[PDB]
Design an enzyme around this catalytic site. Structure first.
Site, short mmCIF file in Angstrom:
data_model
loop_
_atom_site.label_atom_id
_atom_site.label_comp_id
_atom_site.label_asym_id
_atom_site.label_seq_id
_atom_site.Cartn_x
_atom_site.Cartn_y
_atom_site.Cartn_z
N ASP A 325 0.81 -1.21 0.00
CA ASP A 325 0.00 0.00 0.00
C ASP A 325 0.86 1.27 0.00
O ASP A 325 1.81 1.38 0.77
CB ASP A 325 -0.93 -0.01 1.21
CG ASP A 325 -2.37 0.19 0.83
OD1 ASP A 325 -2.81 1.37 0.77
OD2 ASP A 325 -3.06 -0.82 0.57
N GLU A 354 0.82 -0.97 -5.59
CA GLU A 354 -0.35 -0.20 -5.98
C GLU A 354 0.14 1.23 -6.22
O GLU A 354 0.30 2.00 -5.28
CB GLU A 354 -1.41 -0.24 -4.87
CG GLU A 354 -2.63 0.63 -5.14
CD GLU A 354 -3.74 0.46 -4.11
OE1 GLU A 354 -4.62 -0.40 -4.31
OE2 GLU A 354 -3.72 1.18 -3.09
N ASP A 421 -12.85 0.59 -3.12
CA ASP A 421 -12.76 2.05 -3.23
C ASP A 421 -13.47 2.59 -4.47
O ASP A 421 -13.35 3.78 -4.79
CB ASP A 421 -11.30 2.51 -3.28
CG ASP A 421 -10.60 2.39 -1.94
OD1 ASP A 421 -11.27 2.58 -0.90
OD2 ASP A 421 -9.37 2.13 -1.92
#
Ligand SMILES: [Ca+2]
Ligand SMILES: [Ca+2]
Lengths: 585, 585
Positions: A325, A354, A421
């Protein structure tokens, strides 16, 4: 031709080895400008009199503005010097080398890939090359253990509409109880968002990296999940939030308590003591002014060593990889050493990042194996869901992205349709299942790793976060089993056709008017053509098929047998119908 | 404008930090296509409606086909997203971002430099930014001790013409005895070609990495050289040959003796056994079939550790840096770890590589500090010596090379005129001293680190190896002291004019007819304009000088004062005359 628009560099995504003795090289030129690209090469120490080897660079693709030529160089000495021979539409030729362009080869100079070290050959886990990953948002997948529910948990029903602070009790025990379901679906790995101990509802502000959050389970339960998933051929991928910790992290609480007297003050980025305030803070955090998320100084040897110990701990538990992340905000050395550590402990552990922008800096082979293909999601959204772009644009977008990184990375990019998300893809499709299915058909036959967002396979819908995080629908009568069987079938096909997992990709047909796009996946002599009629109308198309690739195909979805007549294949597709044509090889 | 010729990438040589809060960004476009380039940026987490910051990108230069624009982004948050606004000749406004080109800013998307870590800010030794290096070929510089002279050593005379196997007796004691000479010249560092124990004449086939070759001296003598050089303000740079070892290297000798049972078999690249024989090689070597130079497997952690120990040893002796030989054939991880080791032991130790092609992969800041500027040599040879190219082409080659790497690397590249492997530069000029001087004047005022090949400063000449390795001329009567004083003077000026060592470079004038080239070195308010009349004709030139940078200049070589009128400067240069104009700031 227009020489200023021609490009190549002896590194990165334009020059990289695929083996110790083979160098892939790519070159781009303004679309239509170059008709033939040839590579003349030899060992770097070869006498100026010896003959140069020849390599024809086929057109690997073309996007909105460029043509991409690709060639494979056989370098038994593991050292190569080479120059390009470029030919235009009117027969004009030119040599292109490190020195520049010239009609004379010698004056063009030569590009050079000094040496091919085996340790620098981009290598990714074999299993990840043909995996189908399922994203589990733990709090909302399955509540196997009611006794660990957070206070104020709401009822688990289809009509439920999640609020930002809602709780439903999803946990690891639930995932365990549902492994039979995941196995039936055919997924080969589960990807979890953060699950380590944290005081918040999201868990991105880590309190304890060495513990499972109590509401989700504990170490013994996690171990059980790993073992139960493994025997069902299902791997476990955890989300690592190493860029920042939570304000409950032992190191941070110590700093809050001792200020400049803390032995950990340098594990963070603090401007001045005392350290705190509401909505205001004298220390760097994730994003802007997020008090509960102090940024970690990963450049600090102590911080790095600690996070590495965390990584060791979970891998000792048997996990198969990491999803990182906010990885672009932690330094490169950390990632280069992280990889060395991870791969030393488990050569088959996957490292996925990511990054919401060009990730080439992390995809050379020394850091991540892959990243989330947000580009794929964008192209699929606008093509299948919103209809904002047509087939040729879709083609261009796909191609441009494909040429962004070395093939080893592109091959394992996680191709998602949505996430915890974003709004669910079904909803992006305005509830149209025909559109949704065509997108899934494309997702399951395209280059990269398919990532399924929990519930999508049974037709769940939802607006963006938090509405995309509704509790998983388990009542069979309320699930879309038609869709479920569709995913299952596509998944079975992907595993049976080597082309769909380890093949290259080439555009086969693109019609902006009919809005039909077709592509071919190839490995050895096998060809699998995928034709997508992305229109609510029955349409007929003529595809080009030189007999060398075959003259007979089988639609793996229907069993229909099609035949090419005189190098042409006439096809009639129903509204939003997709065909998966296997050439039998 | 040709959009397919526009280039930028958020990394490498086009996007890199110069500090923790400042990002340098560069953009390339077809020459003449862009007349104005602006950058609109902001923190990566800034709200969509927040006002974007502005940075104008000035044209940093032009080569044969492209213009190069450069801007500096102020990033307090250390995170930045940005898009370029390009203006064409007809005023067309084009936005350029990661997504692509568009008339609308939003559709062009944005490039992103995720985070600027202080550990990733390319940093080089301060002393190296203003150094003048002297290349010493030990066997031919000075014989201070005849007792170590190899049998057959010939006479040390100006009329001596070396043969491939000649011996003159040069040694380290000799260098020590000549330090007063070197201090007078003004050199700040000495670079030595291989001097470790080896059975050959050249010593590139290392027998013992931990010993000075007996014919050059011993450890106590080396230490004395380090100390005596240091108190004179002269640093010591050694040549490290880590790509391959000599066949006399202990590990290899062991392999040739124990073969398959050799504890060191994996320290090299061995095809089969027996390990070797006369005229036959079954192991990889430097270049092609060089039995005396077996390649080292630096990827082997044991080999790495041994070579690192070698480095530790010599740095303990107080050396100040390393010049790497055949560095592009050693893996990157080795170089990254090597840099980490070297800098941790001595942050001021310099690391220079020798790569005869684009070395950007080693010049990002985590491996080498710089490399030999062979492009610089090629340009000065064709411009000043042979006359193959004119001023505008010279300008182009210079600019192109300058844009290859981040500024921190470009600033410290070793700008040599010749070497122990090439003919003497004076010979390249056909013995024309006037031409030789203009090239030296340029070498001493251009961007990079001047490297002086022993003897060039006193007028030595010679054909290529071995004629370029003649005994140093120590007889004042036989030395070109006029030239020596010229060198001394230029080195003196370089030391007191800050813009000559730490300033940027900007072409000032280039005329293919007059063959006159001029450039400006700038640091803060200081400007030093170098005007090169590279023609055997007294010429007059009118240079543009907008009053903002000054109206009066001092030629630092003659004491002549020149004045500009209405933004122009009229200069009259004699044949091959060069002017160094200081703006008094
Ligand atoms: Ca629960
Ligand atoms: Ca001697």
């Amino acid at each position: 031709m227009l020489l200023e628009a021609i490009f190549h560099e002896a590194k990165g995504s334009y020059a990289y080895p695929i083996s110790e003795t083979q160098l892939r090289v790519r070159l781009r030129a303004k679309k239509g400008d170059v008709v033939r690209c040839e590579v003349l090469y030899a060992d770097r120490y070869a006498s100026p009199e010896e003959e140069l080897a020849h390599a024809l660079a086929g057109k690997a693709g073309s996007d909105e503005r460029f043509d991409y030529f690709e060639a494979l160089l056989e370098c038994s000495t593991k050292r190569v010097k080479y120059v390009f021979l470029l030919t235009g539409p009117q027969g004009e030729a030119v040599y292109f080398g490190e020195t520049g362009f010239s009609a004379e080869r010698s004056k063009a100079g030569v590009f050079q890939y000094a040496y091919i070290h085996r340790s620098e050959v981009f290598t990714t886990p074999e299993w990840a090359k043909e995996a189908v990953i399922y994203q589990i948002f733990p709090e909302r997948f399955a509540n196997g253990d009611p006794s660990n529910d957070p206070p104020g948990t709401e009822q688990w029903a289809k009509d439920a509409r999640p609020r930002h602070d809602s709780f439903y009790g999803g946990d690891l025990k639930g995932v365990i109880d549902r492994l039979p379901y995941l196995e039936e679906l055919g997924v080969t790995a589960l990807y979890f968002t953060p699950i380590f101990a944290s005081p918040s509802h999201h868990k991105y502000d880590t309190a304890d990296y060495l513990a499972i959050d109590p509401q989700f389970g504990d170490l013994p339960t996690f171990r059980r999940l790993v073992d139960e998933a493994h025997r069902r051929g299902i791997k476990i991928i955890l989300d690592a939030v190493f860029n920042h910790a939570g304000d409950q992290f032992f190191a941070f609480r110590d700093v809050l308590q001792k200020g400049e007297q803390s032995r950990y003050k340098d594990w963070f980025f603090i401007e001045d003591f005392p350290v705190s305030k509401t909505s205001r803070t004298n220390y760097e955090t994730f994003a802007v002014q997020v008090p509960a998320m102090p940024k970690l100084r990963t450049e600090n040897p102590e911080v790095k060593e600690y996070l590495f110990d965390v990584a060791r701990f979970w891998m000792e538990q048997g996990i198969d990889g990491w999803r990182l992340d906010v990885a672009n905000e932690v330094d490169h050395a950390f990632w280069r050493e992280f990889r060395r550590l991870v791969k030393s402990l488990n050569p088959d552990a996957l490292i996925v990042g990511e990054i919401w922008h060009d990730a080439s800096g992390w995809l050379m082979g020394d850091q991540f194996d892959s990243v989330m293909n947000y580009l794929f999601r964008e192209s699929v959204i606008r093509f299948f869901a919103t209809g904002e772009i047509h087939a040729e644009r879709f083609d261009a977008e796909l191609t441009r992205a494909r040429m962004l990184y070395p093939e080893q990375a592109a091959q394992g990019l996680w191709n998602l349709l949505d996430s915890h998300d974003t709004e669910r893809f079904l909803t992006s499709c305005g509830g149209n299942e025909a559109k949704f299915r065509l997108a899934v058909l494309f997702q399951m036959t395209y280059l990269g790793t398919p990532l399924i967002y929990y519930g999508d396979e049974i037709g769940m819908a939802g607006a963006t976060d938090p509405d995309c995080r509704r509790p998983m629908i388990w009542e069979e009568k309320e699930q879309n089993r038609g869709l479920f069987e569709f995913y299952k079938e596509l998944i079975r096909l992907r595993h049976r056709l080597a082309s769909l997992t380890r093949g290259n990709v080439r555009s086969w047909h693109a019609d902006k008017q009919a809005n039909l796009y077709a592509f071919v996946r190839t490995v050895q002599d096998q060809h699998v053509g995928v034709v997508l009629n992305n229109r609510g109308e029955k349409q007929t198309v003529l595809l080009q098929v030189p007999e060398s690739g075959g003259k007979t195909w089988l639609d793996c979805l229907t069993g229909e047998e099609v035949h090419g007549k005189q190098g042409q294949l006439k096809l009639t597709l129903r509204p939003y119908q997709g065909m998966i044509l296997w050439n039998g090889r």
